Amino acid sequence: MGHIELASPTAHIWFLKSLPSRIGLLLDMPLRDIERVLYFESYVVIEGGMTNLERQQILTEEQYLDALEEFGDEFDAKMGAEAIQALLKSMDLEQECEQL
Amino acid sequence: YSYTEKKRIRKDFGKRPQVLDVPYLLSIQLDSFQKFIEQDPEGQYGLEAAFRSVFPIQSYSGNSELQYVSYRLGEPVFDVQECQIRGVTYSAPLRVKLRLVIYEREAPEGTVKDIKEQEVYMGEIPLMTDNGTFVINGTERVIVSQLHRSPGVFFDSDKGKTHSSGKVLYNARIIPYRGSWLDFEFDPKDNLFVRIDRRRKLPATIILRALNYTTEQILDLFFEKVIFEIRDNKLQMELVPERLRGETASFDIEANGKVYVEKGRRITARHIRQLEKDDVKLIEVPVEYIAGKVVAKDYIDESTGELICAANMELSLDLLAKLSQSGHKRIETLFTNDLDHGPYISETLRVDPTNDRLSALVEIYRMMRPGEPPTREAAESLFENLFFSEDRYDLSAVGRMKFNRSLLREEIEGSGILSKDDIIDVMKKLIDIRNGKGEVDDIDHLGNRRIRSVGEMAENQFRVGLVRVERAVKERLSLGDLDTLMPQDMINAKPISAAVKEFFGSSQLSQFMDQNNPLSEITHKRRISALGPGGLTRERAGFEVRDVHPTHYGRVCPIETPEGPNIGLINSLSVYAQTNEYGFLETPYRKVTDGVVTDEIHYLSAIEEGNYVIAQANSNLDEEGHFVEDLVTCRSKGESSLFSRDQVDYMDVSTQQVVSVGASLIPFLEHDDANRALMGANMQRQAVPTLRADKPLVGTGMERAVAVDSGVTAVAKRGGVVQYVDASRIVIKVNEDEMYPGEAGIDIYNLTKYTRSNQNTCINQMPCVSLGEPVERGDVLADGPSTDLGELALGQNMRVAFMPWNGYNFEDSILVSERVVQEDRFTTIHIQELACVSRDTKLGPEEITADIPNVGEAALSKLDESGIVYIGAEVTGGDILVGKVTPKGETQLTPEEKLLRAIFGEKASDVKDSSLRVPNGVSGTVIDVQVFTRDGVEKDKRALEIEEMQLKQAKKDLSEELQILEAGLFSRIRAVLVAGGVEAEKLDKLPRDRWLELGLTDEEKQNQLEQLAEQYDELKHEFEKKLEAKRRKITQGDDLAPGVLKIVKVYLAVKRRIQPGDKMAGRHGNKGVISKINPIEDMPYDENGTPVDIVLNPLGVPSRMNIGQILETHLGMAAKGIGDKINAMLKQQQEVAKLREFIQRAYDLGADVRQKVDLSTFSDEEVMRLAENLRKGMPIATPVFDGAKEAEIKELLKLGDLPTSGQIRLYDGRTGEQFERPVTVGYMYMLKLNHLVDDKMHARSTGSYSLVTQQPLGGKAQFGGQRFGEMEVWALEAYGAAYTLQEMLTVKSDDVNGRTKMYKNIVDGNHQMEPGMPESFNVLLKEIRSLGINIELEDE
Amino acid sequence: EEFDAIKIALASPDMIRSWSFGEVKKPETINYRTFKP
Amino acid sequence: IHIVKELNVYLRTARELSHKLDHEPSAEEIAEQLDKPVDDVSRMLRLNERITSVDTPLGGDSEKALLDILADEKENGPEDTTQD
Amino acid sequence: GITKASLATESFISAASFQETTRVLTEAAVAGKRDELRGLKENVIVGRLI
Amino acid sequence: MLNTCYRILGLKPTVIFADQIMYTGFAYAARSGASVGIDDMVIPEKKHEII
Amino acid sequence: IETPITANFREGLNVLQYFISTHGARKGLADTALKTANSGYLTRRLVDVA
Amino acid sequence: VPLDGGRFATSDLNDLYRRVINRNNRLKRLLDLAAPDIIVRNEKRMLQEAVDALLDNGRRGRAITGSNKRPLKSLADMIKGKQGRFRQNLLGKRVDYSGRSVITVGPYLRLHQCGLPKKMALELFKPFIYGKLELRGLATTIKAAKKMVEREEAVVWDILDEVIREHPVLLNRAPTLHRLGIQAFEPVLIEGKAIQLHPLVCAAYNADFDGDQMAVHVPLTLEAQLEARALMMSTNNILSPANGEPIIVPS
RNA sequence: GAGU
DNA sequence: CCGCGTCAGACTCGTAGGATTATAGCATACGTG
DNA sequence: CACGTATGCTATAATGTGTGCAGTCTGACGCGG
Ligand SMILES: [Mg+2]
C-alpha cells in the first residue's frame, strides 16, 4: 500500500454520515451542526476559557466578530475539520463518562 | 384466386366474411421514420420541426444571428449491402443551408450589413431500410417503439398515503413534453399546495400571487358568495335553497310569514323544494350566526379611510357592528360547506406567508434556489422562464390537446406555454374532484398512455445535438468577428452526430434485430416497450401497469409478452391496431346504423371507445341486414353485457383483432390456456429455419401475410413473364399494360444467397418460379429462409403419437425416430464469423504470414502462401484459419531452460503465434473470406486474389445489366418501328448497332423513339460511372481502427444435425428436449406399416390445458389422410376429371365455409400443379377464434377414411404385438428452437483466472467455470460435506499455491488436499484498510 | 499463514503510514509512450 | 502539452476537411492535407483513444463488468505451474 | 427478529457479510471487536474447514 | 409403500425396490397404449341446463 | 371478477372469454417472476440466523 | 490494463484518486502562495468532497458521475451489496472442475447413476488422465499427455473409463433450495452431448426436461469423493429432511 | 432470451 | 406523533460490443546520449 | 547540441452558477424537532 499526505485534515465519511453519527454521537453534537462547521458556514467554540462562552456552541460569521473585540484572546473557536478534530482530541472520555 | 394461390390453395374453416384485410405489418416503423425525414413546409415534422424549434438563433450581444433555410440528405456513400459487409453505418450526409445575418448597433435594426449564406455539413443520419431496420456498424438493428405517460394533465391520489389516517390526498400533475413539472396536491389538513419538480412544498395561493392575483380576486375565482344585507336592526341573508342540504338548521328558519324549519332540525329534500317553489330570496337571521363566516372582499370606512376588515377574515359581532356603523349594509362572505363546496383556498391563504406578488415571486425563487440572495430581476426571470417561456417549456400539441380535453374545453390545439387560465382550471378541477364531482384518471388507461415511435425519438435526440451546438454558436458569435468569421467555422458536426450515434447505439430501445426467423423480425418490429429513457424501470415497476387492461382490447395483445421481469412492460401490438396521429392507439370498428351493419370502418381511440357500445365479432349477422339474435353481446364503459339490436353502435371488424401477429398464427388458440399460448407464441419466435422449408398443414391463414410483409421473400413488382430464372437471380419481363413506355421494362431481382444472420443462422433466398412462367404483381418469386411458396414455414409437421414410452418421454421429453434425422429435415445451417486482426504494437507490427513456429505440414496444406485458409476447406477445432504472428519481447529464462537451450541449441525465435484457429468442437466448411487492409500497407497475395474476383465479377454483373437492358430496349424500338414501317425480318438483317438512325413519320411514335434513344445513351454513360464507382470501392483502402493494420474475416458454414439435448416444441407452448433417437425398427407403427416420427407424452396435456395441440393433431391427421388419398390417386393416374370431383367435394366441406373454390374455372393443367402440391398433405386454415369446429373436423376424417376419434391401433416395434388401446395419432407442426445442446454444452478443468479476485472467469466463450453461489454452498453445509466445500472455496477457486499443489498431487495419484487462504479475502482486508479501517489478523 | 482471529479497530494516521511503502504525490499513472509507471 | 497541441491541430484540420468532403476524414486524407506522414497522424489518433472503465457493466444490463471477463494473462494455469 | 438476531451475534464477519455492511463495520471498528471465527459463515469466508 | 419398506427392510432393499418399480411402471405404462383424444373429455348433458 | 368463465376448453372459448382469462393468467405469471425474490430472501434470512 | 485493441481500461478508483491528489496538491500550492482565505476554504471543501466520493460515492450527496452518466464505483461499493466482495466473490465462488449442459431422461439408469457425455468427462478428469497415462508409461511427459488427449486417442477412452469407475460426480440444479438439489452419482459415459438424469430424483431437483440444464462438479480429494459417496449419494439420501417423507417417489 |  | 432518511428487494444460465469533446501559438527551460 | 518535456507570457473591455438530467416504487425502522 501507499499513502497521501493531506494538507488539511478530512473527516472519514463512514464515521460521520453512517448513522448513528459516531462522531456526532460522541461529541453529543447534532449532525447539522457538525456540517455547518465543516463546510465553513460557521465557527465552533473549542475552548472558551471564559465560562461566558461554553464549549461546542456554534457562532455565525458575524457572531465571531462581536466577541472578538469583547472577550477575544480567552476564547478559541475555529472552523472546519481542524476544529472538529481538535474538539475530539481534547475531550477526555474518562472524566465525561463519570460525569454522565 | 391469384397465380401463386392456384399453385396451392389453403382450405378455410372460417365463417366470418373479412370486411377488412390485415394491414402492412411493418406500418409503424416505416410511416414514423418517413415522417421524420419528410420535409414538411409549414407543419413542422421531424427534422424540419427541430430546425424551426431551435432556429433562428442570435448571439449573446444580439448583433449577429444564424437563420435556417433548408436541409438536404446526400444519397448514401455505401449502399446497404456494402455497409453490412464492411461494418459501416448506412447513412445520408446532412447538408444544411444557413444564413449568417448581422445587425448594426448604430442603425436601429440595420439588417443590410452582412449576410453570408452557405451549406454546412453536420452529421450523417442513419437511414431506415426497406423493411424497417437500421444498419449500424454492419448489423441490422431495430428501434422499438416506446410507451409513456402522455404530456398533459393527470389527476391522481394515493389511496390512503398515511396508513394511520387513511385519508385520500388528491393531486394534480401537469406534465409537459419539455419543462419543469407542476404539481398540485392536498395535505391532510385540506390545504392546497404547489410543488415544482417535487421540491419543497408551497402554499398553492403563492403561485397565483406570482400571477398577480390579490386576495380578493383569488377568492372570487374559487369561491362563490353569500351576501348579507343589514336592514334596520335585523340581519338579512340572501339565500339559495340548495345550499342548506344535509345540514342541521342552527336557528329558526322563517321567511315573510311562514315558519319552515326549527332549531336543531335536519333539512331534507322536501324542505328545499318547498323553499325553492315559494321563491325565497332574503331571510331574517341572527347576528350570532355570522361568527365564523369568512368575509370575502375588503371593507374600508369611507369616512376615515382605514381598514375595518381585510379579506379572508373571520367575522364577529364587533366587526359586524363596526361595519354597520361605518355605512356598509351589505357584506360578501364565502359560500362554503364542509361537504360540498369545501373551503380549501380560504384555509390555504391563512397558511400563505406571502403578501404581494413580488413577495410570492421571491418565495418561489427561494425554493428552487435556496440560500442565494434573491433579486427581483432573477425572481421575475425565473418564474417566466419556468412555464412561460417558449424556449424552456412546451406541452406540445399532444400535451395541450390532452390537457384541453381533460378540462372539457372546446379548442384542441393551442399554446405550448401555460396561460393563467390553464393553471386555475387545473386547480379548479382538482378541487372539484376533492368535493366529489369528477374522477381521477389512471395511468394504465390507454387514453393516458401514448406511443412514441422511432421518428419522434430521432427528432428528440437531434434537437439535443442542435442545442449543444447552439451554446457553442452563441459563445463564438459574441466574441467573434463579423467579417472574417464564416458560419461553418462556428458549427461543429460532432455534438449532433454524437447525440444521434449515441441514440442508435447506446439506447435500450435500439437493439440487435431478432432475425432467427421471419416471424421473429416481424413481431420484434411491432413491439412496444415501456422501458428505457423517459419510462419505467424493472425495479420501479409495480403490478398494476403490467396486468391486462380493458383498453388493451383490439390495441395491445394480452397474450404476448415475456415471462421474465419484463413481463408487463414489453408488449406486442394487436393486429389491426394503429398509431393515432397524436400517438394514441386505435382499433377498427364497423359502424352500425339502425341495426344495419355498414362496411364503413372507423378507427376509435381509447377515449372514444368508452363512449360507444360495441358488439362482438361473434354476433350472428342476418345476411347484410342486422343482428340475427334480439339479444346481442357487446361491451362499453370497459364492461360487457347484453343489449338490444338497435342499441348497438359499432361492432368488431375481425375476430383476430384482439390478438397480436404471433398469437394469430396459433390455430385453435380458442382451446388453449393463455399461459401456454403465451409461451407458444414466444417460442414460435425462436424457431430456427431448417434445411427444407416445410409448410404447416394445420395453419391459420396469417402464414402467407407474414411471410410476404416481412420482406424476407422476394416479391414481384410488376406482373409479366419470367425471362430468366437462376439460383442467383430472377429476370422478369413486364406485361405491356403495366410496362412503362420509357424503359425496356424488364425487372431484375438478384437473390441473396447464403448469408449470416445475427443469431448465426443461415439466410438464403430460393426461387419459387419456373422459367417462362406468367406471374402476377405482388406474387412471391423467391422464398426467404423460412417460407414456402409465399407461406410461413417455421418448422416441419410430422406424424406424432401420444403415449408413454418407457420413460423416454418423461417430463415433456421427446422420443423421435431415426427417420427424421436420416431425412435431415430438422438439420440446420449455421454461419459463424471468425476474425483475425493484425495490430501494430509497441514492439512492431503483427504479420499475417504462413511462417509460424511449430506448425505441421498437414496444417499448412490448407493455408495458402498468404497464410489464409482456402475457400471450400473443411475445418475442425484446432485447425488454423488465418496465420498470424506477433513480435515477442525479453523473458528471463529459468536456469533449467538456459541449460536445456544450451544443450539443444534451439535458441527461441523473435516471433510468437497469435493465429486465429477454429474454436473447439465447432467444425464446418470455409465458405467465404474477406480482407481489410489499411490505405498504405502492402496487400497480401490473397487479398489481391479476392479483389481480382470482385473486379471481374462486378464487371460481369454490370455487363449483364447493360446487355439485357440493351436487348429489352431495342426489342421495344423494334416494335415502335413496326407501327408505321413494318419490315419485321428485313429490319433485323443488318446489324443492331446501326438501328437508331432509322426514324418514322413526324408523329408521337417518332418522339417515343427519341425517348428510347436518349435513355440508351444515358444508360451508356451511366454504366461508365457506375463501374468507376465499383472500381473505386473495391480499390478503396479501408479506414480501420487506429492500431489495426489489417483484418481478415472468415465465414464458416456448419451443418448441425439434431441430437439428444436439443430443444423442440409446438405452437401451444409444449416444450420438450430430445432424450433419445430411436431406431425405426423400435418405433410404434400402425396397421398399415407406417411408423410414427415422434412419440410425445400424453401426461403433458391435462396439467397444461393446451388442447390446441390435440385438435391440431386430429385435424393434422385428416389433412394428411386427404393428402394420401390425392397421392394415391396421382400414383394410379385416374384422370383430371376424377381428381377434380374429389377435390371440389373436399374444399366445399364445412358447415358454413366462407371461401368457395369452384374448380370449373381452373384449367386442367392448373389442377395438376395444385394436386401435385396437395399430395404431401392438404393444408388447412383454422382462424384464431373463428376456427374449425369438431363436427367439421370429424367430417374431414371420414373423407380420409380415418376414425372419428382420431385414435388408431398401434403396434410396438420391439415386440410386434399391439398396444392394449388406440392411441391418438396425427400430424403436429413442430419446431426446432435455437437452443442447441451444441451451444450449451461446456466443461472446464483448469484455465484462466480473474484479475483481482483470482477466481476462475465466467461464461463458455471465455472458457469459464460455473458459479457455486451462496445457495449452492449452503447445500453442502447442510449435508456436512466439509472437504468438498473447502475444496470449492480454495483449491478450485482462489488459493493459488493450493490449486497448483493440488493439481500436481492429482497427477501423482495422491488426492491430497493442501488448502490455504483465498486471495479474494486478502483483497478484502486491503480494501478495508484503503477505507482507513485497521483490520488485523491476530494470529494464534 | 494461519491465524486464530481477526480484529477491526480505527485506523490511526500513523498506522496508515505503517502500511505505506511510499507517498503518492502525482496523478500520473504511466508514461504515454513507454507505458511504464 | 506538445502532443496534445499537435493532436488538436489534427482535429481542427479534420473538422474543416469533414465540412467540405461531406465525410469524416481518413487518417491519410488528414495527412495529405498537412503534407505529413500517415504514421504521425495514426500514432496521434491512437493516443486519442479514450479509456473504458473496468467496472462498467456490460450490455445495458447491470449484470457484470469487464473485470468479470478479464483474465490475468501472466498468471498461468495450475497446469503451467505444475509443469515447471 | 431474524434480521436483528443475526446482527446481534458476536461475530462481526457474519453480521457484515449478511447486510448493512457499512454500519456493521463502523460499529466493529470503533468497538475494537475481535472475531475468533466460531461460525460456518466465518470459516467459509476465509476458505477454511467448516 | 416405499415408506413401509424403508421402515421394515431398510435402505438397500428400498433402493433396489424403487428402481424395480420404476422399470415395471414405465414398462406397463407403454404397453397400455394410454393416450389423449378429444372424445375422453366427456361432457355432462346437464351442462346447458345448470348454466 | 363478477362474471366467471362458463365455457370450457374442449368447446372453445370466444374472444371475450379468452380476454377475460388473460387477466388472471398474467397476474399469476407475474407473481412467479416477481414474488419468488421475496420468498428466496426469506430463505436467506432464515439461513443466516440458523 | 491494456485491452488487445490498444485500448486501456482502468478501475474507477484511479479516477477518484486522481481527483483527490489534484485537489490536495493544489491546496499545498495555495498554501505556499499564502492565498486569501476564501480560496483556501473552497479548496478545503473540495478536498473533503473528493475524499468522500473516494470512500463512499453516492452517500453524502450527488455521486460523482462518469461521462456515461453512471456514478463512479467507490471503495465502499466494492464491499457493499450484492455486487460486493462478500456476497459475490467470498460466500460464493466460481469453481474449477465444473461443467454444465442440457439434461434429458435416463429411464435405463439405476438410482445411483447418471449419463455423462464423454467429451465433458474428458475435460473434467484431465489431470487424472495425465497421472494414469504416466503410470501406464504411455505418456512420457505431461506435455505429451496433453497432446495425446487433444488427439483424443482410442487408448485414452479406455483410460478414461478406468478412472471414472467408482468416482462420484455432483449434479446440481438451480435454484439450489435444499440440499438434495445437489446429489452425487456414479457417472456412466455416453456418446452425445446431454446429461442424463435418473427419473426418480427429478422430484428433488424439480427437474422437468422442457430445456432444463444442470451443473456437474468433480469431488477431487479422497475426502471429497468419500463425502460424496457416503453423505451425498442419491441412494443414501431418500427422505426429505423437512418432513420424514421419501422424496424419491415415482411420478 | 433459458429453466425455475 | 410527523417527516424525512436509509436500508433491504431468489438462484443459475445467455447475447453483444461500445460512446464524447478539445484544450492558441511561440520562446525559453530542464535533462540525457 | 539536440530531443522531449515544461514552464511561460500575451494588455480595448469583459466582474455571482444554472442546463441537464430525475423520475416520483415499497414496506420498515430510527432520528430531530
Ligand atoms: Mg422445467
CSV table of N, CA and C in Angstrom, one decimal, chain B residues 543 546 548 553 557-558 567 571 616 618 640 658 669-675 678 1185 1190 1270 1274, chain G residues 9-16 18-19 21-23 25-27 29-31 33-35 44 47:
chain,number,residue,atom,x,y,z
B,543,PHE,N,-47.4,-3.7,-10.2
B,543,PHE,CA,-48.1,-4.8,-10.8
B,543,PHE,C,-49.2,-4.3,-11.6
B,546,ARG,N,-48.6,-3.7,-15.3
B,546,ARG,CA,-48.2,-4.9,-16.0
B,546,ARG,C,-49.5,-5.6,-16.5
B,548,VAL,N,-53.4,-6.8,-17.4
B,548,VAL,CA,-54.1,-6.6,-18.6
B,548,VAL,C,-55.2,-5.6,-18.4
B,553,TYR,N,-58.0,-4.1,-25.4
B,553,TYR,CA,-58.9,-4.7,-26.4
B,553,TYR,C,-58.7,-4.2,-27.8
B,557,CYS,N,-51.9,-6.9,-27.6
B,557,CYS,CA,-52.2,-8.3,-27.4
B,557,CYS,C,-52.1,-8.6,-25.9
B,558,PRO,N,-53.1,-9.2,-25.4
B,558,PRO,CA,-53.0,-9.7,-24.0
B,558,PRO,C,-52.1,-11.0,-23.9
B,567,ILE,N,-42.2,-8.8,-17.8
B,567,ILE,CA,-43.5,-9.4,-18.1
B,567,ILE,C,-44.6,-8.4,-18.4
B,571,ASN,N,-44.6,-5.4,-24.8
B,571,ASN,CA,-45.8,-5.9,-25.4
B,571,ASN,C,-45.9,-5.8,-26.9
B,616,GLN,N,-69.7,-7.7,-30.3
B,616,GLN,CA,-68.6,-8.5,-30.5
B,616,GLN,C,-68.7,-9.0,-32.0
B,618,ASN,N,-68.5,-12.0,-32.9
B,618,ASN,CA,-69.1,-13.3,-32.8
B,618,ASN,C,-70.7,-13.2,-32.9
B,640,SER,N,-68.9,-5.8,-20.1
B,640,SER,CA,-69.6,-6.5,-21.1
B,640,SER,C,-71.0,-7.0,-20.7
B,658,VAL,N,-58.3,-8.8,-31.5
B,658,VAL,CA,-57.9,-8.8,-30.1
B,658,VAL,C,-56.5,-9.3,-29.9
B,669,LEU,N,-56.3,-21.6,-30.9
B,669,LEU,CA,-55.9,-20.8,-29.8
B,669,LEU,C,-57.1,-20.8,-28.8
B,670,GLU,N,-58.3,-20.8,-29.3
B,670,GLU,CA,-59.5,-20.8,-28.5
B,670,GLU,C,-59.6,-22.0,-27.5
B,671,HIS,N,-58.8,-23.0,-27.8
B,671,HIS,CA,-58.9,-24.2,-26.9
B,671,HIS,C,-57.6,-24.3,-26.0
B,672,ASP,N,-56.8,-23.3,-26.1
B,672,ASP,CA,-55.5,-23.3,-25.3
B,672,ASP,C,-55.6,-22.3,-24.1
B,673,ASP,N,-55.2,-22.7,-23.0
B,673,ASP,CA,-54.9,-21.8,-21.8
B,673,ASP,C,-54.0,-20.6,-22.3
B,674,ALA,N,-54.3,-19.4,-21.9
B,674,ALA,CA,-53.5,-18.3,-22.2
B,674,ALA,C,-52.0,-18.4,-21.8
B,675,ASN,N,-51.8,-18.9,-20.6
B,675,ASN,CA,-50.4,-19.1,-20.2
B,675,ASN,C,-49.6,-19.8,-21.2
B,678,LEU,N,-49.0,-18.1,-24.4
B,678,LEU,CA,-48.0,-17.1,-24.3
B,678,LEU,C,-46.7,-17.6,-24.6
B,1185,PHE,N,-60.1,-17.3,-33.5
B,1185,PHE,CA,-61.3,-17.6,-32.7
B,1185,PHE,C,-62.4,-18.0,-33.7
B,1190,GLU,N,-65.6,-29.2,-34.1
B,1190,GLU,CA,-65.4,-30.6,-34.0
B,1190,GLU,C,-66.1,-31.4,-35.1
B,1270,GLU,N,-23.9,-18.7,-3.1
B,1270,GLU,CA,-24.2,-18.8,-1.6
B,1270,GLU,C,-25.1,-20.0,-1.4
B,1274,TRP,N,-24.6,-23.5,0.7
B,1274,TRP,CA,-25.4,-23.9,1.9
B,1274,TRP,C,-25.8,-25.3,1.8
G,9,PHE,N,-62.5,-25.6,-22.3
G,9,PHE,CA,-61.5,-25.7,-23.3
G,9,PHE,C,-61.9,-26.5,-24.5
G,10,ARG,N,-62.6,-27.6,-24.4
G,10,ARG,CA,-62.9,-28.6,-25.5
G,10,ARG,C,-63.9,-27.9,-26.4
G,11,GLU,N,-64.8,-27.2,-25.8
G,11,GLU,CA,-65.8,-26.4,-26.6
G,11,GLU,C,-65.2,-25.2,-27.3
G,12,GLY,N,-64.2,-24.6,-26.6
G,12,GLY,CA,-63.6,-23.4,-27.2
G,12,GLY,C,-64.2,-22.2,-26.7
G,13,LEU,N,-63.3,-21.3,-26.2
G,13,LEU,CA,-63.7,-20.0,-25.7
G,13,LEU,C,-63.8,-19.0,-26.8
G,14,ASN,N,-64.7,-18.1,-26.6
G,14,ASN,CA,-64.8,-16.9,-27.5
G,14,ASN,C,-63.8,-15.8,-27.1
G,15,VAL,N,-63.8,-14.8,-28.0
G,15,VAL,CA,-62.9,-13.7,-27.8
G,15,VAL,C,-62.9,-13.1,-26.4
G,16,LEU,N,-64.1,-12.9,-25.9
G,16,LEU,CA,-64.3,-12.3,-24.6
G,16,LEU,C,-63.9,-13.2,-23.5
G,18,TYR,N,-61.7,-15.5,-23.7
G,18,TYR,CA,-60.3,-15.6,-23.7
G,18,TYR,C,-59.6,-14.4,-23.1
G,19,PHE,N,-60.1,-13.2,-23.5
G,19,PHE,CA,-59.7,-11.9,-22.9
G,19,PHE,C,-59.8,-11.9,-21.4
G,21,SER,N,-59.9,-14.3,-19.4
G,21,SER,CA,-58.9,-15.3,-18.9
G,21,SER,C,-57.5,-14.7,-18.7
G,22,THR,N,-57.2,-13.9,-19.6
G,22,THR,CA,-55.8,-13.3,-19.6
G,22,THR,C,-55.4,-12.6,-18.4
G,23,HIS,N,-56.4,-11.8,-17.8
G,23,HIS,CA,-56.0,-11.0,-16.6
G,23,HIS,C,-55.4,-11.9,-15.5
G,25,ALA,N,-54.5,-15.0,-15.7
G,25,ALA,CA,-53.3,-15.8,-16.1
G,25,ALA,C,-52.1,-14.9,-15.9
G,26,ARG,N,-52.1,-13.7,-16.4
G,26,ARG,CA,-50.9,-12.9,-16.4
G,26,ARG,C,-50.5,-12.5,-15.0
G,27,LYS,N,-51.5,-12.2,-14.2
G,27,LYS,CA,-51.3,-11.9,-12.8
G,27,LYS,C,-50.5,-13.0,-12.1
G,29,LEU,N,-48.6,-15.4,-13.7
G,29,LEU,CA,-47.3,-15.5,-14.3
G,29,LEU,C,-46.3,-14.4,-13.8
G,30,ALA,N,-46.8,-13.2,-13.5
G,30,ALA,CA,-46.0,-12.2,-13.0
G,30,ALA,C,-45.7,-12.4,-11.6
G,31,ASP,N,-46.6,-13.0,-10.8
G,31,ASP,CA,-46.3,-13.4,-9.5
G,31,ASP,C,-45.1,-14.4,-9.4
G,33,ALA,N,-42.5,-14.6,-11.5
G,33,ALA,CA,-41.3,-13.8,-11.7
G,33,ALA,C,-40.9,-12.9,-10.5
G,34,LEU,N,-41.9,-12.3,-9.9
G,34,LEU,CA,-41.6,-11.2,-9.1
G,34,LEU,C,-41.6,-11.6,-7.6
G,35,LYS,N,-42.4,-12.5,-7.2
G,35,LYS,CA,-42.5,-12.8,-5.8
G,35,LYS,C,-41.5,-13.8,-5.3
G,44,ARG,N,-33.1,-16.8,2.7
G,44,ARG,CA,-31.7,-16.3,3.0
G,44,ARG,C,-31.6,-15.8,4.4
G,47,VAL,N,-31.7,-18.8,6.9
G,47,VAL,CA,-30.4,-19.5,6.8
G,47,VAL,C,-29.4,-18.7,7.6
